[PDB]
Amino acid sequence: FMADLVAKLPAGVGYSWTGLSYQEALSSNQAPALYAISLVVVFLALAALYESWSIPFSVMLVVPLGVVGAGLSNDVYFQVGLLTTIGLSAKN
Amino acid sequence: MANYFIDRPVFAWVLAIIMMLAGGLAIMNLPVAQYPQIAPPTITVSATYP
Amino acid sequence: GMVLAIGLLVDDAIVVVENVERVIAEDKLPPKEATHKSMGQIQRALVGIAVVLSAVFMPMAFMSGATGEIYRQFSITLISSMLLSVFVAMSLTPALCATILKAYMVVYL
Numbered sequence: 524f525m526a527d528l529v530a531k532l533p534a535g536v537g538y539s540w541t542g543l544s545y546q547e548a549l550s551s552n553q554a555p556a557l558y559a560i561s562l563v564v565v566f567l568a569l570a571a572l573y574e575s576w577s578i579p580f581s582v583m584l585v586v587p588l589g590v591v592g593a594g595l596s597n598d599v600y601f602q603v604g605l606l607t608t609i610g611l612s613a614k615n
Numbered sequence: 616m617a618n619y620f621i622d623r624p625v626f627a628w629v630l631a632i633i634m635m636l637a638g639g640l641a642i643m644n645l646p647v648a649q650y651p652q653i654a655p656p657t658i659t660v661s662a663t664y665p
Numbered sequence: 666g667m668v669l670a671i672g673l674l675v676d677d678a679i680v681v682v683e684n685v686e687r688v689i690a691e692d693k694l695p696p697k698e699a700t701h702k703s704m705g706q707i708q709r710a711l712v713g714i715a716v717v718l719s720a721v722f723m724p725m726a727f728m729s730g731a732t733g734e735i736y737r738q739f740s741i742t743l744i745s746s747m748l749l750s751v752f753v754a755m756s757l758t759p760a761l762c763a764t765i766l767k768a769y770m771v772v773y774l
Contacts, residue, residue, distance in 0.1 A: 550732060557732060568721040571629040572714070589774075603739060607669050614673065614714070623713075630720065637724050 550599070558602070562590070565606060569613060583613075666739050670746035677711045677754040685762045696763045704759075711754060715747035 529538045540548050566587075573580045586609075597605075620627050684707060688699045725740045 546731075553730075553732065557736075564721060564725070567629055567633065568717070571626050571721070572710075572717055574623065575625045611669075611672065626717070633720075633724060637727070640728075 561606070562587075565609070568610075666742035667746065670743060670750075673746070674750050674753070677750070678758045680707060680711070681754065681758050682762050682766075685766060689766065689768065693768070695768070696766045700759050700763045712751050715751040718747045719744050 526538065529536065539545075566583075569583045569586075570576075570580055576584060681703075685696070685700055685703050688694065688703050689696060692699060692702075694702075722740050722744050726737060
């Protein structure tokens, strides 16, 4: 919203983020790719142990539908905490 | 050690696929060059005296 | 990281001790030879799970980036975690138990 506000300012005026905002911007613009590759890795993890679509790993094949179904957000720690919760349920 | 993998077949296949993934990422993202960088490092000093 | 690594250790130890205790209670056997008999039943995934987790976390540490360095604080501690777990479950607990043990899809949606 502040970016659009600056877009409303007269021409010749730019903007940039520094400190914490720059770090979060650098995380966010590359977060989807790393999250996708981590999801692929964890899918291989939940596809290699019970030998392929054997018994449960075919129902974990339905997990991506639940993931896509899932403005409220979550912090960086909880994004790995959800994966760890999935892993601990898998181990259970 | 073979019996460890014979009774667990598709896991070796999974390892093969992750080897393909690593190799593809390496061959794509590496500074691929036609020839080895045999050229020694060079330091250039420039000064101007109008 | 190591906090999440804590919970994956006790399972193997408790399985080992329950097997040892059932063996001694059934055979009236001293703990040493009972344990020596005891490994030939549970040689299964408890090591294989650690092996698989180490394998899946193996190629995460070869890519760079600040977010990658952050993820190392999880990945390296995890691989060390199951490596220590597979060491301890086959090394330490047997010695103890030998030396101390006295004689709906919509519902999921």
